[PDB]
Amino acid sequence: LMTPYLQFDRNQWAALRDSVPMTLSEDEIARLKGINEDLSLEEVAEIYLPLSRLLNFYISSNLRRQAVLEQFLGTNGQRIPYIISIAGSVAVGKSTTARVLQALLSRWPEHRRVELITTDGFLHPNQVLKERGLMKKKGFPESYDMHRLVKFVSDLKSGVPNVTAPVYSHLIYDVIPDGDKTVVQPDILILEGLNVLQSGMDYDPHHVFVSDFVDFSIYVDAPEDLLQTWYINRFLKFREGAFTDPDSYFHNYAKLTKEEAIKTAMTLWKEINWLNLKQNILPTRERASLILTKSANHAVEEVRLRK
Amino acid sequence: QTLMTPYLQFDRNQWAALRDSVPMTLSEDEIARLKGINEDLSLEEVAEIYLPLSRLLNFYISSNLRRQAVLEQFLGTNGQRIPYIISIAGSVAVGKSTTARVLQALLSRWPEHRRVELITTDGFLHPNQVLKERGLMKKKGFPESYDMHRLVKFVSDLKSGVPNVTAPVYSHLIYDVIPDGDKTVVQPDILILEGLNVLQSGMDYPHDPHHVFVSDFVDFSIYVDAPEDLLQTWYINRFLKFREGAFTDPDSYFHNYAKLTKEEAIKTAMTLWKEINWLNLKQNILPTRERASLILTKSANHAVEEVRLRK
Ligand SMILES: CC(C)(COP(=O)(O)OP(=O)(O)OC[C@H]1O[C@@H](n2cnc3c(N)ncnc32)[C@H](O)[C@@H]1OP(=O)(O)O)[C@@H](O)C(=O)NCCC(=O)NCCS
Ligand SMILES: CC(C)(COP(=O)(O)OP(=O)(O)OC[C@H]1O[C@@H](n2cnc3c(N)ncnc32)[C@H](O)[C@@H]1OP(=O)(O)O)[C@@H](O)C(=O)NCCC(=O)NCCS
């Protein structure tokens, strides 16, 4: 049977960097690393530079997801921002991928704005999730306010005046009451979150989805077993940092012994994030324009490009 | 809110206005020859409905093609040429066969000459024998009465450029697939796939929806639409014409229907619609409607008075 994806291993993908030079120092790179997430200069050069290239070809060739329709009715004024999305399991390290992609796309061919918006800011406040009995489902599609997320991207893309975005706080495990921040129309918009690939055709009737505004979608992938230990390990680091803040919504986790923490982390993964993984995330994997698969060392050892 | 309903709605004048300057490459005589039984196709229908569609469809194809090129540059390799796949779905008697026929004529000479193969999904039905053994032929046309492992393998082979691909052929005279009727299919530039089950997918009944459907190979899908009441009378009327033509053949699987009085025929046609095709309609077809890239809604005169494009 024919498959829609082209597969490359590290050497093959890396070989596609051609001559894009790199615009980042090791120091700058290290600052982009996420908790329990390693990012080397070789990872940037071998994985992200070839991606920068491709991504750049697509942008300069005004080949967007809404290009055909525009020409079919009316191309107007354009100047339309390029929209890239980044999806994948919690703890997969999609936040680091977004950060470096944004740094590179910012100075690669020429200076571009490049805004990085995270989808979590668009979650329904803990209050609402409470009223809908949805917070054993934080991160699930229904725990997000997408009428707003879609309205946001539409406004940004379409050049609407004063657009603002809600902001999420991991310290209080909820969106900041009056934290909305203005977002200036950028040249490129990177959208990172769990629900960025949702479509009315994985599950639903119509409704409209944020994925319908995306031009290129990246899915950061890793086997279930690796994601489990990554989640647990990352949890243990939170115990040493974020959780030590007395105002932390999970401050009590700072007090758990190391073995209780591991226990608590597993049930949190198994009973919530894993469900989300299997139910709403994995299914979207084969819909991405690009898939990056990481190994035990957090490095991408395989790339799949949808032809 | 219009910002978020997935479909863009146009009426005849609005859609028609989108034809721009695509010229037409068909004479009235050529068009008339494309009409199906009990199906009217005018030159205005072609110009107002199918030309704008030819345009859009064409934009998609070259875009889709331009893409293969950037990637080609990026990879540093060449030799693409993946056929463009269009599908056509809709109720039995909705006139989806006519739509396929004209779309294929137009796409064949519009921007430039393209091959354009038109395959009908019925050829892939399980022979009457198999349907018999599974007690499935009060369900001819239902998803399960089709051999899709084969339909999918076919499209995959065609798209992927496999050597000698062949397709099974269906015969309405014998109400079954032709025992040794398989015909070779040369890889085309465009493949139009028309049949009842072309939009089926995992969403349709989620129980090991971990299967592959032909709809996963389609690039653009068109759904020919018409209200239930219109489809019923269109089915009955069409049946009455079969009575005057196809059924008059002594070898027709339904020859006995030629002998029915006009009132018995109407009665026979209704129960055939109500007990079989209507079920299929409600159960497996209607549900797929809102998944199509485009929806063409026809009125009592068989003309498309409304078009819905999925943004
Ligand atoms: C809010 C939430 C949905 C975010 O999910 P996400 O979009 O998949 O993104 P990620 O899981 O990749 O995490 C993204 C960033 O937030 C951080 N993060 C995630 N959860 C965190 C937490 N509870 N406390 C502090 N930081 C957290 C990561 O460190 C990462 O940033 P980095 O780049 O600085 O490392 C997830 O934290 C949440 O609530 N999940 C539901 C159950 C659960 O695990 N709850 C928290 C239990 S302590
Ligand atoms: C085989 C069958 C599944 C085809 O269904 P389909 O894919 O929906 O396509 P359509 O109903 O739109 O018909 C397609 C073409 O076949 C013709 N056709 C359909 N049924 C026919 C029949 N019984 N005899 C002769 N021609 C028939 C139409 O005239 C049309 O071609 P046209 O463009 O020349 O008009 C349908 O004929 C069948 O068997 N349905 C089950 C119950 C039923 O009605 N059976 C036949 C009762 S007489």
Q: What is the spatial distance between Cα B109 and Cα B106, in angstroms, rounded to a whole number? A: 6
DSSP string, B223-290: EEE--HHHHHHHHHHHHHHHHHTGGGSTT-TTGGGGSS-HHHHHHHHHHHIIIIIHHHIIIIIGGGGG
- Give the residue among A126, A119, A97, A117 at the shortest CA–CA distance from A29: A97
Of residues A58, A61, A208, nearest to B6 (C-beta): A208
Residues in A whose CB is inside 8 Å of some CB of B read 1-2, 6, 16, 53-54, 57-58, 61, 63, 66-69, 71-73, 147, 150-151, 154, 200-208, 212, 305, 307
Closest ligand 1 atom to Cα of A253: 48
Alpha-carbon distance values, B270 to A141, B136, B274, B299 (Å) = 45, 20, 6, 20
- Give the residue among B108, B7, B8 at the shortest CA–CA distance from B50: B108
Q: What is the spatial distance between Cα A298 and Cα A93, in angstroms, rounded to a whole number? A: 8
Sheet holding A5-9, edge to edge: A5-9, A300-306, A290-294, A216-221, A82-87, A188-192, A115-118
Residue B271 burial (C-beta neighbours within 10 Å; 0-12, 13-18, 19+): exposed
In the reported structure, the alpha carbon of residue B273 is separated from the centroid of ligand 2 by a whole-number distance in angstroms of 11
Per DSSP, what are the bridge partners of residue A275?
Answer: none
Segment holding B129, helix H or strand E? helix B128-133
What are A260's two structure tokens? 């209780």
Q: Which residue has the tokens 């759904």?
A: B223
- Give the residue among A82, A44, A58 at the shortest CA–CA distance from B72: A58
Q: What is the spatial distance between Cα B256 and Cα A198, in angstroms, rounded to a whole number? A: 53
Cβ(A89)–Cβ(A281) below 8 Å: yes
Alpha-carbon distance values, A106 to A23, A59, A217, B264 (Å) = 9, 13, 18, 75
Cβ(B193)–Cβ(B99) below 8 Å: no
**Residue B306, φ and ψ in degrees, nearest 5:** -155, 135
Which residues, including other chains, have CB under 8 Å from residue B203's CB and lie 6 or more apart?
A: A201, A202, A203, A204, B209, B291
Q: What is the spatial distance between Cα A122 and Cα A145, in angstroms, rounded to a whole number? A: 6
Domains of chain A (ranges; CATH) run 1-307 (3.40.50.300)
Segment holding B97, helix H or strand E? helix B96-109
Q: What is the spatial distance between Cα A189 and Cα A80, in angstroms, rounded to a whole number? A: 10
- Give the residue among A282, A16, A26, A216 at the shortest CA–CA distance from B77: A16
Alpha carbon dihedral B37, B43, B45, B50, in 10-degree steps, equals 100
Buried b (16+ CB within 10 A) or exposed e, A151-182: bbbbbbbeeeeebebbbbeeeeebbeeeeeee
From A33, A86, A95, the mutation candidate for ligand 1 (largest count of ligand atoms within 8 A of CB) is A95
Integer-rounded Cα radius of gyration of chain A = 19
In the reported structure, the alpha carbon of residue B92 is separated from the centroid of ligand 2 by a whole-number distance in angstroms of 7
Question: Cβ–Cβ of A206/B5 closer than 8 Å?
Answer: yes
A 10 A CB-CB count for B31 gives 20
Q: What is the spatial distance between Cα A306 and Cα A197, in angstroms, rounded to a whole number? A: 15
**Residue B130, φ and ψ in degrees, nearest 5:** -60, -45
Q: What is the spatial distance between Cα A155 and Cα A255, in angstroms, rounded to a whole number? A: 45
Alpha-carbon distance values, A84 to A208, A210, B163 (Å) = 18, 11, 38
Resolution given for this structure, in angstroms: 2.5
Q: What is the spatial distance between Cα B273 and Cα B138, in angstroms, rounded to a whole number? A: 11
Q: What is the spatial distance between Cα A23 and Cα A42, in angstroms, rounded to a whole number? A: 13
| Experimental determination approach used | X-ray
Q: Which residue has the tokens 């030819």?
A: B54
Of residues B18, B75, B82, nearest to A73 (C-beta): B18
Size of interface A-B (CB pairs under 8 A): 72
Amino acid at A9: D
Question: Cβ–Cβ of B290/A205 closer than 8 Å?
Answer: yes
For ligand 2, is residue B173 a contact (CB within 6 Å)? no
What are B246's two structure tokens? 């196809």
Of residues A53, A54, A208, nearest to B5 (C-beta): A208
Set of chain A residues whose Cβ sits within 8 Å of the Cβ of B212: 1
Which residues, including other chains, have CB under 8 Å from residue A293's CB and lie 6 or more apart?
A: A221, A222, A300, A301, A302, A303, A304
Q: Which residue has the tokens 């090791």?
A: A26
- In 3-state terms, what secondary structure has residue A151? helix
Amino acid at A178: D
Helix axes B228-244, B262-272, angle to 10 degrees: 130
Q: Which residue of A has its CA nearest to B16?
A: A73
Amino acid at A292: L
Alpha carbon dihedral B166, B170, B173, B178, in 10-degree steps, equals 50
Segment holding B119, helix H or strand E? strand B117-120
Helix axes A49-60, B51-75, angle to 10 degrees: 150
Give the residue numbers of the binding site of A: 88-95
Q: What is the spatial distance between Cα B80 and Cα A210, in angstroms, rounded to a whole number? A: 31
Per DSSP, what are the bridge partners of residue A292?
Answer: A220, A303
Cβ(B10)–Cβ(B44) below 8 Å: no
A 10 A CB-CB count for B291 gives 22
What are A151's two structure tokens? 């309205």
Q: Which residue has the tokens 């009085």?
A: B261
Cβ(A120)–Cβ(A86) below 8 Å: no
DSSP string, B14-78: HHHGGGTTPPP---HHHHHTTPPTT----HHHIIIIIHHHHHHHHHHHHHHHHHHHHHHHHHT--
Torsion sign (Cα): B100, B102, B105, B107: negative
Which residues, including other chains, have CB under 8 Å from residue A11's CB and lie 6 or more apart?
A: none
What are B193's two structure tokens? 């796939």
A 10 A CB-CB count for B159 gives 19
Amino acid at A57: F
- In 3-state terms, what secondary structure has residue B218? coil
Q: Which residue has the tokens 């120092």?
A: A25
DSSP string, B136-188: -TTSTTSGGGB-HHHHHHHHHHHHTT-SSEEE--EETTTTEE-TT--EEE---
Pairing of β A5-9 and β A300-306: antiparallel
What are A7's two structure tokens? 């597969």
Q: What is the spatial distance between Cα B96 and Cα B88, in angstroms, rounded to a whole number? A: 7
Helices (H), A158-297: 224-240, 258-268, 274-276
